Design a protein around this ligand. Structure first.
Ligand SMILES: O=S1(=O)N[C@@H]2[C@@H](O)[C@@H](O)[C@H](O)[C@@H](CO)[C@H]2O1
Ligand SMILES: [Ca+2]
Ligand SMILES: [Ca+2]
Ligand code: NA
Length: 434
């Protein structure tokens, strides 16, 4: 057997990323997303008022890969062109994790003050969504120019995925208000945990009350649980360290369920642990890595194995599965990053080469299924051979899985792997070595 040449595989990831970037420059320059089958662009936040989403998402990946000319071309576009004084509604959660976080990682890589100025300007526009709630729970949408808010029927992910970006803003700016605003919203829902330690995933920004009874690790909730741990790691916050482990141990006690010998975390009633759903999202795979981070690595490996089963059986992990049968519930995909997310997070603990093996399967399968004329695309149908394609490269592809693969394979000297911290959008918030 020829041992894998990990440096060669990293160089292939870089080559493919640079090739994809060239397609973006050719077909979608300054636009939010490329449609790489048609060779066109689409808007993400505001129809017809693109904000360079994929360009911004790509920046820290480009830098980490040593694609310096490409990085600088993107940074220079941002500095000349990007602004947020726009009379249109933006989804607060998406805007923070993609644009605030993408500008912050680019700022930390480069030192360029303008990138921080723009991140902070955008955060100040998002802050109006928090200020519009007497509980500090952000409304889901805000008008970037006027501050007008819409839709208070929100969820843990959309109230609780700010503290990393906002806390880094507080560190860099010296203004504590960003950290405090993000932490306050998380504390609100944690103070409403049931006696079994769970939160329902759906919450109202104005009443402050839960609007469902369903505890979740995936839809409506995922990154809330990450950002508790990540705030301990990034800021030393004692409360978040406590909360992170309490929340995960409640989930292990009441949501961990085995079906056909495999670990899943279906939805349960947040006050009884009784099962209220049978679906698991592909996107739940982040949790395997979080389990390892919080000191539950055997459980994290067991959960990873459930997704390794889906990859081995279906090639591409189905977008959703029925835990009771282990079979797909959907045939389309979102070109999703969570399996290599988990592999990188678990690999950062002891550098076990098994995680590299598994992530290499995932990268090669992405190449075999999602490659299109001008980049990489989400899929229409994973059950046909070949798998049929839809026509969209999601913005998160630019920040997430190509970075994950590259960090797993490259051992790049541009990252201090002991200090590396990643947001839920894979924006690097600590660990650059200039
Ligand atoms: O399942 S999600 O709703 N939560 C994920 C975020 O944490 C980011 O990783 C990224 O924007 C997408 C990756 O699939 C999100 O899809
Ligand atoms: Ca994520
Ligand atoms: Ca994480
Ligand atoms: Na990024």
């Amino acid at each position: 057997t020829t041992p894998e040449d990990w440096k060669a595989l990293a160089a292939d990831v870089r080559s493919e990323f640079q090739w994809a970037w060239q397609g973006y420059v050719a077909k979608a320059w300054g636009k939010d997303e490329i449609n790489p089958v048609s060779g066109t662009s689409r808007s993400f936040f505001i129809e017809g008022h693109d904000l360079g989403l994929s360009l911004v998402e790509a920046l820290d990946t480009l830098w980490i890969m040593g694609l310096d000319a490409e990085f600088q071309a993107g940074v220079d576009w941002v500095k000349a062109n990007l602004s947020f004084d726009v009379d249109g509604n933006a989804q607060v959660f998406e805007t923070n994790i993609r644009l605030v976080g993408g500008l912050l990682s680019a700022h930390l890589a480069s030192g360029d003050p303008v990138l921080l100025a723009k991140a902070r300007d955008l955060a100040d526009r998002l802050a109006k969504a928090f200020e519009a709630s007497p509980h500090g729970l952000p409304w889901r949408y805000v008008n970037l120019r006027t501050g007008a808010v819409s839709d208070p029927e929100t969820n843990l992910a959309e109230i609780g995925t700010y503290l990393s970006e906002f806390g880094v803003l507080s560190q860099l700016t010296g203004e504590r208000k960003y950290f405090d605003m993000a932490k306050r919203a998380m504390r609100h829902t944690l103070d409403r945990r049931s006696k079994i330690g769970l939160m329902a995933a759906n919450i109202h920004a104005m009443t402050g009350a839960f609007t469902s009874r369903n505890a979740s690790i995936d839809v409506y909730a995922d990154s809330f649980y990450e950002y508790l741990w990540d705030a301990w790691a990034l800021f030393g916050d004692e409360d978040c360290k406590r909360w992170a482990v309490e929340c995960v141990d409640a989930q292990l006690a009441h949501q961990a369920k085995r079906y056909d010998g495999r670990l899943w975390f279906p939805m349960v009633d947040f006050e009884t642990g009784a099962v209220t759903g049978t679906a698991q999202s592909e996107s739940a795979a982040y949790y395997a890595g979080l389990l390892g981070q919080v000191g539950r690595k055997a459980q994290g490996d067991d959960y990873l194995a459930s997704f390794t089963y889906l990859q081995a059986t279906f090639g591409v992990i189905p977008e959703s599965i029925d835990v009771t049968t282990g079979q797909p519930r959907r045939k389309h995909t979102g070109l999703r990053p969570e399996y290599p997310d988990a592999c990188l997070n678990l690999w950062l603990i002891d550098r076990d080469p098994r995680y590299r093996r598994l992530a290499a399967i995932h990268y090669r399968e992405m190449k075999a299924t999602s490659r299109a004329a001008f980049g990489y695309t989400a899929l229409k149908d994973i059950t046909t051979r070949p798998m049929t394609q839809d026509d969209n490269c999601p913005g998160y592809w630019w920040s997430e899985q190509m970075k994950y693969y590259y960090l797993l394979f490259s051992d790049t000297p541009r990252i201090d792997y002991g200090q590396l911290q990643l947001s839920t959008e894979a924006n690097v918030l600590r660990g650059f070595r200039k």
